[PDB]
Amino acid sequence: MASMKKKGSVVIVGRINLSGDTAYAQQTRGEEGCQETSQTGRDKNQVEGEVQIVSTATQTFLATSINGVLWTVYHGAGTRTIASPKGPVTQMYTNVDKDLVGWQAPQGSRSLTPCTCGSSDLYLVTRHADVIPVRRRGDSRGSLLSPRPISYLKGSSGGPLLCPAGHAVGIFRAAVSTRGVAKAVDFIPVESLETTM
Ligand SMILES: COc1ccc2nc(C)c(O[C@@H]3C[C@H]4C(=O)N[C@]5(C(=O)NS(=O)(=O)C6(C)CC6)C[C@H]5/C=C\CCCCC[C@H](NC(=O)O[C@@H](C)C(F)(F)F)C(=O)N4C3)nc2c1
Ligand SMILES: [Zn+2]
């Protein structure tokens, strides 16, 4: 009872820069500072952009701001708080049935706009800043135009699927593979987020 530990916070450790002509990952915090920030929950680093790279003590994945909420996957974050300049911030959305969590978007982040284009020509943004064309195949599924080993998608849950106009269509949740090759992706549609809200 007196020995019981507390899980650390999710920590923003970088971002995917989409502001220019070139997408690229930036690290903003190294592993040591990440471990310390997870324990204190106090992160005074300035936040920028739409897609954050986040980490716990044991996992790293992505988180995406849409309409003022930083969204990610329950299988990454669980029920964890996120570190912030004035301490841990409790989730404002949690839905294990959708593999979905959300916190208020950090000060300084930019939010994607929810897509209303009805387009099926999508783009998945990974933690390595690859921008992967995906054809929408259903409410929560899309096929990769160029399949590739699942290794290339590992760590990108919580990242966005975008429409041609750069709106948010969904949050990457799981990969569908055959013999280790990702042929399709499973994602949380933005309408499911907009309803949760
Ligand atoms: C605990 O409470 C819950 C509640 C609801 C959940 N709901 C789902 C869905 C789920 O799924 C799991 C996790 C997810 C996954 O792995 N996510 C990616 C990823 O990067 N995570 S991550 O960042 O590395 C990580 C782990 C650090 C956070 C995008 C993948 C990239 C590569 C894939 C690696 C191989 C695993 C394939 C598996 N495929 C799958 O399940 O396909 C479904 C749709 C099927 F089977 F029906 F086809 C799958 O993708 N996952 C299996 N866990 C749930 C758990
Ligand atoms: Zn759109």
Side-chain angles (χ1 to χ4, degrees), residues 54 56 58-62 72-78 95-100 127 140-141 149-158 172-177 182 184-187:
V54 298
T56 64
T58 55
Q59 288 195 121
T60 186
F61 48 104
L62 298 179
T72 194
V73 284
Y74 186 93
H75 79 263
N95 190 327
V96 68
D97 293 325
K98 297 182 178 171
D99 197 13
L100 181 67
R127 74 175 289 114
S140 57
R141 295 285 181 101
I150 51 175
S151 312
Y152 288 97
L153 304 185
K154 184 179 184 293
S156 294
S157 69
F172 182 30
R173 173 163 64 194
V176 178
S177 59
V185 293
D186 163 49
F187 64 87

Side-chain angles (χ1 to χ4, degrees), residues 87-109 111-177:
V89 171
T90 297
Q91 286 173 21
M92 63 176 45
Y93 303 103
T94 313
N95 190 327
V96 68
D97 293 325
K98 297 182 178 171
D99 197 13
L100 181 67
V101 313
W103 309 267
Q104 60 212 64
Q107 282 306 125
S109 62
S111 268
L112 299 165
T113 299
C115 181
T116 68
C117 297
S119 176
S120 287
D121 294 330
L122 316 177
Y123 301 92
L124 172 68
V125 180
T126 75
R127 74 175 289 114
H128 307 298
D130 291 326
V131 178
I132 294 181
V134 169
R135 173 69 184 188
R136 198 181 185 158
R137 293 297 189 187
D139 50 2
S140 57
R141 295 285 181 101
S143 54
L144 272 72
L145 272 54
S146 302
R148 60 201 81 191
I150 51 175
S151 312
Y152 288 97
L153 304 185
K154 184 179 184 293
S156 294
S157 69
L161 285 92
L162 306 173
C163 80
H167 312 138
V169 175
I171 296 290
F172 182 30
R173 173 163 64 194
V176 178
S177 59

